[PDB]
């Protein structure tokens, strides 16, 4: 620390890492960049891949949302108990990211024409996470092992945004449904999820969800 | 029997980098090849976590997701930076490689004919960040992060090799990336692997485009 998040005024790709920071009792600074400021161009040019989020951890400057999650996971002990679990955490996170990618493509490039097919395909896209839960302590703890990992925060966000896109999408999945409820009730996270800081930001940048 | 098994289609694709890594690190592995006809039968696919390959076995640990495999071999073989800060930098590089890889995969499989001109025009802007990273690490003379090779080097190396095939001369604009490709490619175990039929006789992609 100290931590700084630099991003647009949306949940988007910072939603998970914010949940992580809040639930872990960490303090951070939000540096909000408006689309108008972004269009000026100087900040963009300074960014490694010309994109946000940008993250500061003292003198360390990071880009890439999953890089930031993994860094926080590594430094805060949210990356499994050992190498085997770390691999499983990665495997979950990479699966979350694949579905997030599809979600983002839909939202920004093909929402109207593409939504019906996306929603019909969604159960098949969620099932692997239900299966993973079913294979770990009967779904009663976390997505990997006995302690929370960065992948839990990312999967939780993925599930929350999909409940908005396709209400009822988890009804067929009892372990996932219970998992969302349980994690969302963790006291610090619950307070964050209730706060205007979360509630009053849109999920995406284009008014679609 | 080797403790590593790679289960994939008969293509370089998303296994090229992890194979280079294993070869360059002198690790033994087994290749289990899945034909497109075998895949269509559906049972293997149904058994894969996300319905896709590669699948990788390290003893009884079964992994899916190409970057998960890279990170796993990175941790277990000591190719993930010297400390926590370097490990984050290695991740930042690999995540950048995979963004460009994704763009490349979309071009190859969904829009090659119509998209290629635009893609190659945009390519220097997409490679520049890696040249910038090289320029800020020991003048580009060693690796992408730090002074030891990482899994991100093998992934970046593969990304660069396949782009030279797509857009020959694309690294002429980037002297550090150019020298880097030559340098890593000359590492003895890797050089042997890259020249071997095991590598050369597989196509880069599954649809004949490159
Ligand atoms: N015409 C598009 C604009 C281009 C675009 O960036 N499209 C996005 C979806 S826009 As979103 S998140 C903001 C974005 N950052 C990233 O994509 C980082 C990805 C990285 N792999 C990571 O995980 O960190 C960004 O900074 N864009 C600026 C730029 O490139 O100039 C949003 C939109 C508006 C307001 C707030 C947030 C895309 O397809 N990304 C791919 C991905 O997420 O992997 C448009 O209309 O928006
Ligand atoms: N909707 C279809 C998907 C079809 C598809 O796979 N499209 C590809 C390009 S085809 As290539 S790589 C072989 C593959 N695995 C992956 O894509 C895993 C991606 C991942 N995040 C990772 O890093 O591991 C696959 O299993 N395809 C078959 C399938 O999905 O049933 C190839 C090589 C040799 C022979 C044929 C094809 C795509 O666009 N992938 C995206 C990406 O690579 O990130 C469906 O699933 O039914
Ligand atoms: As991931 C992702 C990349 C490009 C466009 C949409 C989503
Ligand atoms: As990455 C990626 C995902 C879907 C389609 C093309 C490329």
């Amino acid at each position: 620390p100290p931590y700084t998040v630099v991003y647009f005024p949306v949940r988007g790709r910072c939603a998970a890492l914010r949940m992580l920071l809040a639930d872990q009792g960490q303090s951070w600074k939000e540096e909000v960049v408006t689309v108008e400021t972004w269009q000026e161009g100087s900040l963009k040019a300074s960014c490694l891949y010309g994109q946000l989020p940008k993250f500061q951890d003292g003198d360390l400057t990071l880009y890439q949302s999953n890089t930031i999650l993994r860094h926080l996971g590594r430094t805060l002990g949210l990356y499994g108990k050992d190498q085997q679990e770390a691999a499983l955490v990665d495997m979950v996170n990479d699966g979350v990211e694949d579905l997030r990618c599809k979600y983002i493509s839909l939202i920004y490039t093909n929402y109207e024409a593409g939504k019906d097919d996306y929603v019909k395909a969604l159960p098949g896209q969620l099932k692997p996470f239900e299966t993973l839960l079913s294979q770990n302590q009967g779904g009663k703890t976390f997505i990997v092992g006995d302690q929370i990992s960065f992948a839990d925060y990312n999967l939780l966000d993925l599930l929350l945004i999909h409940e908005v896109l396709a209400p009822g999408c988890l009804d067929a999945f009892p372990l996932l449904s219970a998992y969302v409820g349980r994690l969302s009730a963790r006291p610090k996270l619950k307070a964050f999820l209730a706060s205007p800081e979360y509630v009053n930001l849109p999920i995406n940048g284009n008014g679609k969800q």
Side-chain angles (χ1 to χ4, degrees), chain A:
Chain A
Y3 302 124
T4 306
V5 175
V6 188
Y7 199 52
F8 304 107
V10 309
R11 300 189 197 157
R13 286 191 172 275
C14 289
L17 66 91
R18 287 160 173 159
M19 292 200 301
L20 184 165
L21 289 169
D23 193 49
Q24 292 296 319
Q26 304 298 305
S27 299
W28 76 100
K29 166 72 180 167
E30 296 281 351
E31 290 284 9
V32 178
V33 183
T34 66
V35 170
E36 187 186 334
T37 303
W38 187 246
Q39 287 173 344
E40 186 263 356
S42 60
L43 180 56
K44 172 167 178 75
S46 68
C47 292
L48 178 58
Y49 303 112
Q51 295 198 299
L52 302 180
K54 169 180 176 186
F55 187 81
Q56 289 176 37
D57 184 350
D59 286 319
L60 180 61
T61 302
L62 298 175
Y63 301 89
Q64 294 279 359
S65 66
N66 295 299
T67 286
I68 300 159
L69 288 168
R70 283 185 170 91
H71 170 67
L72 291 171
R74 204 178 284 113
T75 63
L76 300 177
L78 323 172
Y79 216 142
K81 82 185 180 73
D82 58 19
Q83 288 171 343
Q84 174 168 295
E85 284 197 352
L88 299 179
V89 169
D90 282 335
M91 183 169 66
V92 175
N93 202 70
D94 288 349
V96 172
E97 170 68 19
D98 278 353
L99 184 55
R100 185 178 298 281
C101 177
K102 296 183 173 64
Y103 172 91
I104 290 168
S105 172
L106 174 70
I107 291 299
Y108 291 101
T109 73
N110 200 41
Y111 186 90
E112 291 68 30
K115 187 174 175 178
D116 172 77
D117 293 336
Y118 185 100
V119 173
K120 286 173 185 154
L122 185 56
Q125 299 297 310
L126 297 172
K127 191 182 170 56
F129 303 107
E130 176 83 5
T131 300
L132 286 173
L133 287 174
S134 77
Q135 295 166 341
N136 182 36
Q137 309 284 41
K140 302 184 210 71
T141 57
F142 301 101
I143 195 62
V144 175
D146 300 326
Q147 296 180 17
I148 199 154
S149 69
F150 69 88
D152 288 293
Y153 297 106
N154 200 15
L155 172 60
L156 176 60
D157 180 64
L158 183 77
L159 299 170
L160 292 173
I161 66 180
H162 279 85
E163 284 188 319
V164 170
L165 183 68
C169 67
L170 297 192
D171 292 345
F173 299 112
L175 303 181
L176 282 175
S177 286
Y179 167 89
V180 172
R182 190 164 70 247
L183 283 188
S184 293
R186 297 162 64 84
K188 293 189 187 307
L189 187 49
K190 179 185 178 181
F192 175 78
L193 290 173
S195 74
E197 182 169 342
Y198 177 88
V199 175
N200 295 340
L201 286 190
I203 297 174
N204 303 302
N206 69 351
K208 310 192 187 178
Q209 60 174 32

